[PDB]
Amino acid sequence: HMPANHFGPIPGVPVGTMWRFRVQVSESGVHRPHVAGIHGRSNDGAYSLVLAGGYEDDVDNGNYFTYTGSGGRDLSGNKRTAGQSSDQKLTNNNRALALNCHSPINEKGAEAEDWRQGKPVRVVRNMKGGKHSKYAPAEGNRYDGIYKVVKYWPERGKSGFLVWRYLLRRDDTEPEPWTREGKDRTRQLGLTMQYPEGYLEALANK
DNA sequence: TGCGCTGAC
DNA sequence: GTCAGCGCAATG
């Protein structure tokens, strides 16, 4: 098993792989947290993240995307999601993603000096991101490859509350699964949606 | 809309 | 131990 702090691609899991549920993506090692959008360690960096349309400030343009940090929410009442209700902070997961940027951690945001030297982040796109993105898969989760953090900065989001934003750019030798070349690669690799054992059965009989 | 669960600390 | 949390096959 790859360690939890493994940076980079997971051996045996090619770009284009698909899983129906987040828990499955977690077991693959691609994105360990089954809920959180970012998997990171505040004093190391972020190993992966998921675009699932959970934050209104996310902007997905394929090879480039602006990701939103987590937090700035009031999850009281034993919740896991809510609208913005407070300013986000460059701590925990947000500090982790910032560390991937090839530049000294800056409390006011920073820009990378040769973004390609930054730490790699595995990116997964979820179907729920399809309401505001033409790159999200129609179903489940899809591993889209390695991206790097070009820069990050704070600014008020659509809600009026401060949010941390990150510009990610793809840096992977395998083709993007959404392009013509990528769909051919997926076909060539024979990749198909991974469902839990007995899921389809419980779906049909249902 | 709240629960069981997992990773970070 | 405590807390964060881009889930969800659930439930009204």
Side-chain angles (χ1 to χ4, degrees), chain A residues 1-112 114-130 132-179 182-196 198-200 202-204:
Chain A
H1 291 300
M2 290 285 97
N5 58 3
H6 174 72
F7 280 104
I10 302 299
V13 181
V15 164
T17 297
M18 314 162 268
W19 305 265
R20 171 66 182 74
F21 297 108
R22 279 288 303 279
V23 293
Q24 288 176 282
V25 186
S26 298
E27 298 175 309
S28 72
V30 172
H31 189 63
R32 299 294 261 287
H34 58 288
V35 177
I38 301 167
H39 176 201
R41 291 186 174 187
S42 66
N43 203 48
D44 193 8
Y47 315 102
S48 61
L49 66 79
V50 53
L51 279 164
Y55 284 66
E56 74 200 318
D57 297 304
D58 283 352
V59 183
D60 184 11
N61 281 312
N63 281 312
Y64 284 96
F65 70 86
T66 296
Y67 199 64
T68 313
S70 61
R73 302 175 164 188
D74 185 55
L75 301 177
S76 60
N78 189 37
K79 304 173 183 300
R80 307 289 177 276
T81 283
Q84 297 319 95
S85 67
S86 63
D87 294 345
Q88 297 198 324
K89 303 183 179 180
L90 192 66
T91 61
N92 307 317
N93 295 330
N94 299 342
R95 189 182 195 68
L97 189 52
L99 296 176
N100 290 53
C101 188
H102 189 268
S103 172
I105 183 79
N106 192 312
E107 222 55 51
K108 301 185 73 292
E111 185 184 310
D114 187 28
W115 63 280
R116 291 194 181 75
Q117 287 185 62
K119 297 189 188 63
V121 183
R122 296 183 292 280
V123 173
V124 174
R125 278 193 175 74
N126 175 275
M127 68 79 85
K128 291 174 181 172
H132 305 295
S133 171
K134 65 185 183 181
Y135 299 96
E139 182 189 15
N141 300 271
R142 186 187 69 209
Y143 174 54
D144 290 349
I146 297 304
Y147 284 70
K148 302 285 178 58
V149 178
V150 179
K151 56 142 59 188
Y152 59 98
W153 67 95
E155 74 171 307
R156 296 202 270 186
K158 300 174 181 173
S159 68
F161 289 108
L162 184 74
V163 292
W164 271 93
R165 314 192 74 196
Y166 308 73
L167 170 68
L168 279 94
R169 178 173 175 184
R170 198 162 187 281
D171 190 14
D172 200 297
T173 56
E174 282 293 66
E176 314 93 298
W178 62 81
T179 69
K183 289 179 180 179
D184 280 355
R185 180 57 174 172
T186 294
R187 190 175 321 182
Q188 178 176 60
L189 298 174
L191 307 178
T192 67
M193 181 71 66
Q194 285 185 43
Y195 294 101
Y199 176 66
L200 293 178
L203 180 60

